[PDB]
Design a protein around this ligand. Structure first.
Ligand SMILES: CCc1cc(N2CCCC2)cc2c1N=c1c(C)cc(N3CCCC3)cc1=[SH]2
Lengths: 114, 114, 114
């Protein structure tokens, strides 16, 4: 699976270890070896929630299988704690981006992902 | 990949109050509270269209409801209209992609969204 | 989501004609005019895969119709080779992200593509 974190928080206020933690947490969450875990990070973004200078956190996860609307709460419940502890941002301003497209267009190495 | 708005136009071309009217008009059209929506735009990048390295724009219109031929057409004029007056970008140089979400797939506080 | 391309390769290691040769090949490969294919690039991104901080990269695109496993593979094969022999990247973990859409969901030139 692949996870990317987008936030308005400057790199200066961004600590270290979030990469490793996310890799291990996600691996045991999705049920896949850390070898298949892709982590993308990009701080200092020009985003504003509610039309104000309110801190926002965009979390996008891309994985095939083991997905559900009801399960989404439990999945995010394990992620909100991390962001609320590290960045201290409230889950209220967190939007989880996902996909449910057929695995027919989901491949790896010389192929395309969905 | 995740949702994000990018453009080759420098940040210096962005006037003050742009984020205000942008969200105001967006909320007014969508009919949804501005407190539930967020504005994200990363300028000063590199893009081209048809060989021409002229200023271009790409934007994702993720929402829930109000989808229709006429409705979508109205949003196109609203977006390109304001963009052409604030950022001075040609309507033929901006691409808008509409994305609808499930009613049970509402965001805000541990929830998945497009 | 959004069809954004990401790479760990910094602007200090990029070649020339990146928004020219690529689009030209992409257009010829698909059989569509390069004038109808937008091209944007986002470098200097920090990303890791499988725990390895090696220079990873993810590509994406959008097309209406003429898509599928066979079609996508016919395009990805060309992309992987071109990218490898251009940005000096390993083709072992090269993948794209082609996505489809609806004609009425495409806003262009103050109007819809519908
Ligand atoms: C789900 C797409 C797929 C996605 C992958 N990623 C990495 C993080 C971004 C999404 C990674 C893999 C993958 N699919 C396969 C498939 C399909 C087969 C594989 N092998 C290893 C040798 C045996 C066959 C290995 C992978 S790795």
């Amino acid at each position: 699976p692949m996870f990317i974190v987008n936030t308005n928080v400057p790199r200066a206020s961004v600590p270290d270890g979030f990469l490793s933690e996310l890799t291990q947490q996600l691996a045991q969450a999705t049920g896949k070896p850390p070898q298949y875990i892709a982590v993308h990070v990009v701080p200092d973004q020009l985003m504003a929630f509610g039309g104000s200078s309110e801190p926002c956190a965009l979390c996008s996860l891309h994985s095939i299988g083991k997905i559900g609307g009801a399960q989404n709460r439990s999945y995010s419940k394990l992620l909100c704690g991390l962001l609320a502890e590290r960045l201290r941002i409230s889950p209220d301003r967190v939007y989880i981006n996902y996909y449910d497209m057929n695995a027919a267009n989901v491949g790896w190495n010389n192929s395309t992902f969905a």
